[PDB]
Design a protein around this ligand. Structure first.
Ligand code: CL
Ligand code: CL
Lengths: 386, 386
């Protein structure tokens, strides 16, 4: 049972991990004093395995430092750290056609450019949070400008057309962060549209499933890619929705939507043999072909930790406390590196470490610190209401 | 280690496995009578997980059926099966610009097109082998035309330029198969160039390594991708070169080159804790970031089985017999499905099955039947020399 006492202990646990373990692993040592931005591709002991810079993570790291400055402690070095990432994005991470790169060298030369625009969304939330921390009007203007571009990209884009849940999900969280930092009048109405898109097209009540992609009419694509589910990704969307429910005075309709997405994908995603959240599943339980389908990655566990704790504090249903205990204990016992700090990223299905790196092209200071920060803040709010 | 009687038993094993286990799992049942080509995305029990068609594998399967017709038995059903795939490639798998698709639906509608010319290389070997089996001059002309387009691209295949060993390797095998079926005056000279490219740029004697990618001057790219090695892929190239050595009157330079590459990458690739060939390694033993780096895939074992047995027959060095015994026993014990036939594709590092499928977008009737066919043929020739 999750008593107020137990929740007080959890609150302090997440706060301690975030500020004494997770953040100090990255900062300030990751600040690139020569070229700006952050050097984040680090091995278990903090040594660099690469000096390249993932553009998504540059924005995510700048967003995190600004968010800590805004909501934890106005530490100058966090503000200076955030600005370094903001400046690096503006100086080096935009191609001549206006689209952002995905992967650049230490000194900002382009390695790869992806068609999509997730790079832009993370620049939005970085600039929005930094603008609030610093009062920089150029960053606020940039955040709103890029937000409008992302809205256009999402509405004005192979004989098998598919739509992905990732677009409405990322745009929803981008809009939420923009709203909660500097504000934008478009946030609420577009969040409504993206929630409706998730509910209408991707949430399947008859088979108790949340899809990753569907046909334009919402139907299931009964092929290898179309059948492939990502439980952690669906549950990330679930807590985005629960977060919106909380913002809207605990809107019961959004609570039911968020909770059933969580219920559906916990059942499909939790590994009953070894524990943990499996990376991919198949809607019809056909063999999943993506090679890492049964691996245990860090970030699905971060998102399910948030979602279960948030669902519990909203609904008081003890099952979400039980699920939270399971995923919390599994994740901190399997991913956390007590020796060097932070979390390993990649475990085999059975929980054994696959490789020792803690940052790369995809992992950095985002999913874990966000989870510890969100849970710390959530429980502080919850406990000061009781 | 290996007596003549033991080699005779091995010859029969590969022959019976090929003809009574591997080929029957696929054919004739995979021949798509209604739409042409082959339905190859099959679960462990032979049932389809998808009716899509991977263009590479359509060509590979047509090549296999023609090769069995040409070198094993002139079975009409194999010739007809080959023709079905050749016709399917010509009818559906070329775009209007003359470039081949990568992924099509059952009825031939395009799903993905890759800038690649790798689909074309498999169309070359498919058409060349089919041309020899059937006497079809059109297929011969197409094989020789596309071979030239492939050479064209191979000579000209973005701040971090890299070249990959896959290009010279795949072109070498394409040229070898063209030579051994219908012939082409370009084969020998271009194989010489591709071998020289592999030796000059990718084989690193001082560190006993074969690279996957290097910079244009041959230098190692000391970043995550540039450091990533694929031992099975390197050993595939090693036996292509040993194969060429035999054709060139057992050329000592080529024997030494092929063996060196095999020696280097067996040492780096063989998993001493759990057995089997690891998928990826890192040239400086940094953690490999690609998620499936420590998984045990079917096809590296196929290629290493060929290379060790071929190296043993060419050099008489007992160590290659010892390595062949290790990888042969490992692979057949862990991948072969004695109940339903053929091989699983994907094991965890520790050898446990990751998923049950036997065909998908990448696995089909190619690496395994080629290995059993090649080893059966090799041993037949070797034993009649003894
Ligand atoms: Cl992350
Ligand atoms: Cl294959």
């Amino acid at each position: 049972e999750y008593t107020l006492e137990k929740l007080k202990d959890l609150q302090g646990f997440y706060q301690k991990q975030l500020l004494d373990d997770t953040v100090p692993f990255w900062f300030p040592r990751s600040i690139d004093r020569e070229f700006g931005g952050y050097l984040l591709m680090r091995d278990q002991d903090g040594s660099l395995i690469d000096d390249d810079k993932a553009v998504w993570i540059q924005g995510r790291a700048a967003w995190l430092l600004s968010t800590l400055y805004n909501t934890v402690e106005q530490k100058q070095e966090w503000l200076d750290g955030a600005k370094s990432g903001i400046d690096f994005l503006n100086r080096h991470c935009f191609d001549t056609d206006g689209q952002m790169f995905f992967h650049v060298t230490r000194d900002g030369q382009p390695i790869r450019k992806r068609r999509y625009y997730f790079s832009e969304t993370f620049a939005v939330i970085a600039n929005a949070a930094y603008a609030k921390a610093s009062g920089d009007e150029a960053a606020a203007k940039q955040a709103r400008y890029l937000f409008g571009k992302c809205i256009e990209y999402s509405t004005n884009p192979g004989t098998r057309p598919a739509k992905g849940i990732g677009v409405p999900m990322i745009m929803m969280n981008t809009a939420q962060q923009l709203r909660e930092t500097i504000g934008d009048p478009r946030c609420d109405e577009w969040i409504d549209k993206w929630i409706n898109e998730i509910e209408t097209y991707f949430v399947k009540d008859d088979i108790r499933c949340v899809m990753e992609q569907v046909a334009p009419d919402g139907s299931i694509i009964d092929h290898i890619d179309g059948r492939t589910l990502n439980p952690g990704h669906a549950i990330e969307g679930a807590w985005f929705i629960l977060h919106e429910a909380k913002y809207r005075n605990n809107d019961p309709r959004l609570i039911k939507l968020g909770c059933k997405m969580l219920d559906y994908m916990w059942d499909r995603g939790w590994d009953k043999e070894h524990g943990g959240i499996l990376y991919f599943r198949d809607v019809y339980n056909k063999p999943v072909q993506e090679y890492w389908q049964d691996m245990k990655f860090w970030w699905p566990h971060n998102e399910v930790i948030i979602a279960t704790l948030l669902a519990y504090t909203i609904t008081g249903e003890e099952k979400y406390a039980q699920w939270h205990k399971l995923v919390h204990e599994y994740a901190y016992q399997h991913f956390h590196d007590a020796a060097n700090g932070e979390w390993f990223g990649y475990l085999h299905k059975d929980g054994t470490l696959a490789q020792t790196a803690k940052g790369n092209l995809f992992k950095g200071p985002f999913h874990l610190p966000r989870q510890e920060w969100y849970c710390m803040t959530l429980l502080n709010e919850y406990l000061q209401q009781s």
